[PDB]
Design a protein around this ligand. Structure first.
Ligand SMILES: CCCCCCCCCCCCCCCCCC(=O)OC[C@H](COP(=O)([O-])OCC(O)COP(=O)([O-])OC[C@@H](COC(=O)CCCCCCCCCCCCCCCCC)OC(=O)CCCCCCCCCCCCCCCCC)OC(=O)CCCCCCCCCCCCCCCCC
Ligand SMILES: CCCCCCCCCCCCCCCCCC(=O)OC[C@H](COP(=O)([O-])OCC[N+](C)(C)C)OC(=O)CCCCCCCCCCCCCCCCC
Lengths: 60, 74
């Protein structure tokens, strides 16, 4: 709690509700995309050699 | 005295100017709400734009998701 209070996130971004909303919207925007790309990478990591890209078709 | 009554009468002559000042104050308090809602507008309308414009507006950070399909054909 001392660490968090030292970052002064409350003073600058959460004590005023207009800024609270700005924070919510922007953090949403960025976090969603990071989460998405991370799950993409996991989905490619677990399924290696099973997906379409990993095993090209070779013509006869 | 005429002088004092004149001053008291004149105290409110500039009603319209004070009302313009009030307009200014309330709009200054209100207008920052445009930023949250602006971000959300852009959030919703970003995937409607051309792929090139998505790449440009994010300074090249955004790229087509990689889900392991529709790769090149030799
Ligand atoms: C970690 C520890 C844990 C902590 C825990 C703490 C607790 C909190 C949790 C935190 C942990 C993480 C949690 C994960 C959260 C995130 C995941 C998440 O939320 O996903 C949700 C997830 C959403 O997934 P998705 O939507 O598929 O995600 C796709 C992505 O969003 C992909 O979509 P996209 O890519 O299409 O997105 C587009 C995006 C794309 O985003 C990007 O690409 C942005 C890139 C971001 C980069 C990041 C930067 C920051 C990092 C930098 C590093 C700094 C370095 C310094 C520091 C280090 C070094 C010192 O772009 C935008 O948004 C628009 C751009 C910006 C707009 C603003 C305009 C700016 C203009 C720019 C001007 C400048 C000039 C430009 C012009 C060019 C010329 C000059 O949920 C779902 O999938 C849905 C669930 C189903 C539920 C439905 C809901 C209910 C509905 C029912 C309602 C019906 C009932 C009635 C009503 C009921 C009412 C009650
Ligand atoms: C006050 C605001 C009220 C907002 C109410 C609006 C709610 C209904 C929104 C419908 C949007 C439909 C857009 C038409 C274009 C086709 C969409 C589509 O599916 O395209 C294919 C695309 C995908 O394309 P594709 O892969 O199918 O192929 C076509 C490729 N492009 C798009 C490049 C041509 O699908 C989407 O991305 C879904 C559309 C998301 C857009 C959502 C827009 C929301 C609008 C709200 C903004 C409000 C801001 C405030 C404004 C107030 C001003 C006074």
């Amino acid at each position: 709690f001392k660490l968090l209070n030292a970052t002064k996130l409350y003073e600058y971004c959460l004590k005023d509700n207009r800024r609270y909303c700005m924070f919510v919207m922007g953090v949403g925007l960025v976090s969603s995309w990071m989460w998405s790309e991370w799950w993409n990478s996991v989905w490619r990591r677990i399924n290696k050699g099973k997906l379409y890209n990993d095993v090209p078709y070779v013509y006869p | 005295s005429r002088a004092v009554y004149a001053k008291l009468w004149a105290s409110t002559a500039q009603y319209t100017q004070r009302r313009h000042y009030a307009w200014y104050q309330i709009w200054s308090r209100v207008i920052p709400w445009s930023v949250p809602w602006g971000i959300f507008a852009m959030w919703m309308v970003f995937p409607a734009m051309p792929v090139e414009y998505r790449q440009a507006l994010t300074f090249g950070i955004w790229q087509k998701p990689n889900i392991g399909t529709h790769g090149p054909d030799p």
